[PDB]
């Protein structure tokens, strides 16, 4: 791996080395089925979906890691850490939801998959591939569900309007962030910003990571696209100096 230097043979002589490779698909299924069974106890009426849900997450993760190899991009690394983050985020989303149908679970699962395995992509074709394949996996493992509500294209999740982190429509979110941006203009630096849906997605992701403790970002994009502007906006809105 880049940045890693081969070790001295004199040192390796005294030190045995064991290769702790990525856990196998069966191991991942077992571990995250245990986690999901512990996950879904909060909603008893939804407990029965843990086994297919874990299988779906494992299946999508396997094909994501076979597709976006490290060769294509230096940051195209997939690990069980990503799916553990998936589990933690899903649990954080289901915590406030005392009641929820399977459609909401599918929506949150798709949202977290998009926020984990779809942001690191660079090419629009890769993102479209990810969306098509998440659709296929969701339909494969949850056939008795409606596509329009469970997998509505504007997957926008925010805790800004509602008290909880429940899904939010793009238009109401746009209006709220427009009011907040007017307050930003009147208080902070006055630079006109237009609100296209990409801004909405980016600001939601940035606020999500800032809310999480030890929230650390690596903003990558052409200069002037608004990385610093959006970062300052989110920091001001969340009270961070």
């Amino acid at each position: 791996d880049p940045g890693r230097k081969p070790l001295s043979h004199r040192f390796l002589r005294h030190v045995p080395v064991v290769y702790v490779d990525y856990p196998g698909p069966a191991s991942l299924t077992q571990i995250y089925g245990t986690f999901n069974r512990a996950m879904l106890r909060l909603i008893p009426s939804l407990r029965t979906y843990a086994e297919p849900l874990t299988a779906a997450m494992v299946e999508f993760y396997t094909m994501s890691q076979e597709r976006f190899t490290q060769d294509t991009q230096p940051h195209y690394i997939y690990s069980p850490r990503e799916m553990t983050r998936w589990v933690r985020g899903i649990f954080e989303a289901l915590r406030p939801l005392e009641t929820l149908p399977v459609e909401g679970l599918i929506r949150i699962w798709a949202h977290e998959a998009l926020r984990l395995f779809q942001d690191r992509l660079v090419e629009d074709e890769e993102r479209r591939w990810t969306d098509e394949n998440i659709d296929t996996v969701a339909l494969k493992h949850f056939p008795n569900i409606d596509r329009e509500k469970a997998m509505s294209r504007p997957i926008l999740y925010s805790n800004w309007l509602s008290k909880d982190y429940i899904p939010v429509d793009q238009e109401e979110l746009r209006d709220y962030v427009k009011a907040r941006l007017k307050v930003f203009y009147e208080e902070e630096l006055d630079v006109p910003l237009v609100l296209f849906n990409e801004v909405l997605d980016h600001v939601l992701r940035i606020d999500r990571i800032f809310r999480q403790p030890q929230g650390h970002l690596l903003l990558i994009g052409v200069s002037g696209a608004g990385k610093t502007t959006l970062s300052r906006f989110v920091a001001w809105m969340n009270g961070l100096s």
Binding site: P2, G3, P74, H75, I77, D119, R120, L121, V122, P192, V194, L195, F196, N197, E198, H202, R205, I206, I209, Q214, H216, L217, L218, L219, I220, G221, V222, S223, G224, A225, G226, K227
Partner: protein
């Protein structure tokens, strides 16, 4: 990645990339709103050079000019890519360039109107 592992170990990364055609179209409409390019003499061409995905089926004059602006930005990107392919030296074309293009359009239109419409 090689020099610093922490940037890719636990820090999450978000690919802003560049503004899409939709974003550029929205910027063009929002920024070029004060200027009045409402031309009733406009006629819809049989062939319309669409570059914005959600362009309304009847192109208005303002829609046409914003679409042309997005097309100009796309052609700058394409020319930059072509020079990169040919091996010549290249300079990145940022969305800040698009903002400056819109501002210069506003300035030129405002001054030329302020003089020759006074003469009107």
């Amino acid at each position: 990645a090689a020099t610093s592992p922490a940037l890719f170990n636990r820090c999450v990364l978000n690919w802003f990339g560049d503004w899409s055609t939709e974003a550029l179209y929205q910027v063009g409409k929002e920024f070029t709103s004060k200027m009045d390019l409402e031309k009733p003499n406009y006629i819809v061409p049989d062939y319309m050079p669409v570059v914005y995905d959600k362009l309304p089926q009847p192109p208005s004059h303002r829609e046409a000019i914003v679409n042309s602006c997005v097309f100009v930005h796309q052609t700058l990107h394409q020319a930059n890519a072509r020079l990169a392919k040919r091996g010549g030296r290249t300079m990145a074309i940022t969305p800040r360039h698009y903002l400056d293009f819109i501002n210069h359009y506003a300035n030129l239109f405002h001054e030329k109107r302020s003089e020759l419409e006074e003469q009107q």
